[PDB]
Design a protein around this ligand. Sequence first.
Ligand code: UD1
Ligand code: ZN
Length: 475
Amino acid sequence: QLPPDLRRVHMVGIGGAGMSGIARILLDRGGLVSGSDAKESRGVHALRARGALIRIGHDASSLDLLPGGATAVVTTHAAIPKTNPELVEARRRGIPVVLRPAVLAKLMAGRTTLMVTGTHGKTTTTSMLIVALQHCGLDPSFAVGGELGEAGTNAHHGSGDCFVAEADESDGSLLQYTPHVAVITNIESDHLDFYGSVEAYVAVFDSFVERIVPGGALVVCTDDPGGAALAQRATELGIRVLRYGSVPGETMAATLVSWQQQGVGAVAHIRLASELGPRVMRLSVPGRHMALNALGALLAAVQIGAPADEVLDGLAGFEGVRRRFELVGTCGVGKASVRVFDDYAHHPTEISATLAAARMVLEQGDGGRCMVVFQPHLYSRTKAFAAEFGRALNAADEVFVLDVYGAREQPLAGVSGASVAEHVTVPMRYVPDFSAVAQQVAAAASPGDVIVTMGAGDVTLLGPEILTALRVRAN
Ligand SMILES: CC(=O)N[C@H]1[C@@H](OP(=O)(O)OP(=O)(O)OC[C@H]2O[C@@H](n3ccc(=O)[nH]c3=O)[C@H](O)[C@@H]2O)O[C@H](CO)[C@@H](O)[C@@H]1O
Ligand SMILES: [Zn+2]
C-alpha cells in the first residue's frame, strides 16, 4: 500500500520523463494523480488516458482537481518555488511539496532495492541490470533514467520484490535512498556544480555507502581511482565490497581478463570469484567500457541470487540505450558505407571512451575515417575543461566543434565553442551555425567513415540531418 501522503498526488511538470514514470507507478499502485505542465506532450496524453487529471499551464485551481485536495505536491527541478502559482497555493494550503527522489524512495520501501550511481554510465548499467533480471524470468519494479537526460528514462511497477533504480548524484539525491545493493560505476571530478568542492562530492558517495542496509553489498568499479578509493574505505567499514575491473588483486569479485571487438559485437573473457572457470561474456554493444558496466550489472544481479551464467546470457541480449553510441543510420551498404551514431558524451573520459569504441568498430572494417561532431555542454564546464575536451577529441580523424549549449546557464564572457577548438590538434573546423553542420559533414564524408554526433544538447538532432545531406550527395 501507499503511504498516507502519496494517496492524492499533484505533480507540477508531470510531462517530464522521470515524473511520468513516477506518476504511472503511483497510478498502478492505486493512488490518485493530478498534475500540470507548461507544455503539452504525448506523455501528458498517455497519463490523461490513464485517468490522471492534467491541466496545461499552471494555476491554483489545479489543487482542486483531486477529491479532497492533494495529499502531496511533487515538483520538478526546473520549477521555481515562490513564483510558480501551484507551489505557492500548495504552501498556502499546508500541502507538502517534495521532489521526485523522496517519492521514489517511499515507493521503493518494502522492496529489495538496487541503486546504480556514478559520474557517468548510470543509465547503461541500470538498463543492463534490469534486462538481466527480466531475462531470468523476474518482473522487478524499476525507475531508470536521468543521466542521459530523458533518453533511456523508463519506469515500471513490477510484481516482484526487486526495485532497480538509477540514483542521481549531482543534486544530493543519493541520501534519500536506502539501497540493499548499491552499484558505483565511477567517481570523477565533475558535476561539482552543486557541491562547491571535490571533497564534498566524494563525501556524498561516502554517505551513500553509509546508507546501505546491514548485510547489503556495494558493487564498485576499481579501475576508476575514486571508485577504488571508496572500495578501500568501505572495506575498512566492514561492508561487503564486490570489486570489478581490469586490474587483478586478492579481493576482486569479477575481473575483466580480456576484451576484443569483432563484427558481430564484442567478446570479453572474465573471471569470477569462487563464492560467486574463466567465463566468456559476449555483448551486442560496442566499447570496452560496456564490459565493465556489464560486470557491474552481473555482480548486482548475482548478489540477489540470480545465476551468473544465464545473467550473462541476458547481458548478451542488451542492444543499448538511446544516445549511448546509438546507431542513427547508414548510407550505402556493406563496405564503403557511412554509418552515423549518436552519443551523450559530455565528460572528457566519456569522450575518450566513445571515440575509442568508434575506432575499434572502424578498425576491423578494412578502411575508414573517424569524424566526430562534438558540442560542449555548459559554459562553466567548457571554461574549465576545454583542454581536456580538445585532447579527448584528438582521438578522431576529423573534428567538428559546434557552439556551447546554453542549458539555462548564464553565458560567460570570452567563452564559446572555439575555446575547445583551440586545443584540437587533429583536422577540425568550428561550425557555430547549427544549420550548416549537416551539409559540411556530408560534404567532408568519404566511403567507410564512422560519423559520431557527441554532446548532451541540440546535437542529437543533427543525426538524421547528416544522413539526409549524405543521401543528397548520392549523385
Ligand atoms: C532529465 C531531464 O532532462 N528532465 C528531468 C528534470 O526536470 P527539468 O527541471 O529539467 O525539467 P525540464 O525543463 O527538462 O522539463 C521537464 C518537464 O518539466 C515541465 N515544466 C518545466 C518547467 C516548468 O516551469 N514547468 C513545467 O511544467 C516541462 O513541461 C517538461 O515537461 O528532472 C525531473 C525530475 O524531477 C524529470 O522529471 C525531468 O524530466
Ligand atoms: Zn554529466
